[PDB]
């Protein structure tokens, strides 16, 4: 069972710090994340933290630079420090374990650059 | 002025180190990438490095743990160290500046989720 806490009423430009405390179940991909839901909007990812292969953090574009996710290993607690709050931040926030299923990257190229170099790998090389 | 070099004709299990030497400095600290194309196939992303706010590196899944991209700032050169080569790595390799346009993440959540906490941003608080 997972409990988000630390929400409140706050003036624009203020801060809140959310806590997400577990009961001790490191298992289905040790990623914990936060999502929010505001009236009339779809559930939105906010932030996630993995402490599996070192510490990896992720953020929605709209909270980058304002929100910071961290984990206190002793306490088995994940924190979301939320700064520079604005009306679009008003929502119910939830924490949940998450799995990162897939990442799609979209690379752009422009311009003539250079010759290429030919690589051949075969058992006929001698 | 970009120049890819260091290609060859090698046995499987061998290594090559590709070089891509730049003449200037581009945009200050952009992204340089490698892509490849084999006969009769489409271009495929291989790897990229950016040295803007620090170094990040990216790899195709098929080359992770075999290939390493790096940059020697003093020579304005990017390197692709290709170890554990396989027949399927046969292609022409090219270096180019790249931009990362978009990244799409797919996050899975299972089950009932927990108690939520309300955040209300209000000039009245």
């Amino acid at each position: 069972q997972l409990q988000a806490s630390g929400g409140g009423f706050v003036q624009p430009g203020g801060s809140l710090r959310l806590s997400c405390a577990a009961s001790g179940y490191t298992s289905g991909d040790e990623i914990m994340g936060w999502f929010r839901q505001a009236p009339g909007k779809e559930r939105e990812f906010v932030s996630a933290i993995s402490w599996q292969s070192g510490t990896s953090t992720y953020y929605a574009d709209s909270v980058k630079g304002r929100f910071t996710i961290s984990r206190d290993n002793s306490k088995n607690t994940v924190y979301l420090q939320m700064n520079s709050l604005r009306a679009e931040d008003t929502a119910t926030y939830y924490c949940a374990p998450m799995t990162l299923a897939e990442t799609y990257y979209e690379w752009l190229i422009s311009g003539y650059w250079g010759q290429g170099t030919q690589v051949t790998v075969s058992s006929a090389a001698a | 002025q970009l120049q890819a070099s260091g290609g060859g004709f090698v046995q499987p299990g061998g290594s090559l180190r590709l070089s891509c030497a730049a003449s200037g400095y581009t945009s200050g600290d952009e992204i340089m990438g490698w892509f490849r194309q084999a006969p009769g196939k489409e271009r495929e992303f291989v790897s990229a490095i950016s040295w803007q706010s620090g170094t990040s590196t990216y790899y195709a899944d098929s080359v992770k743990g075999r290939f390493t991209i790096s940059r020697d700032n003093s020579k304005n050169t990017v390197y692709l160290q290709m170890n554990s080569l396989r027949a399927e790595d046969t292609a022409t390799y090219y270096c180019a500046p790249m931009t990362l346009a978009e990244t799409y993440y797919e996050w899975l959540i299972s089950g009932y989720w927990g108690q939520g906490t309300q955040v209300t941003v209000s000039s009245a608080a």
């Binding site: - | 990362l100 990244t103 799409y104 996050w107």
Partner: peptide, 12 residues
């Protein structure tokens, strides 16, 4: 700097 889309996918 990094333009990202984070999609959430639930279960049932």
């Amino acid at each position: 700097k990094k333009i990202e889309t984070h999609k959430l996918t639930f279960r049932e």
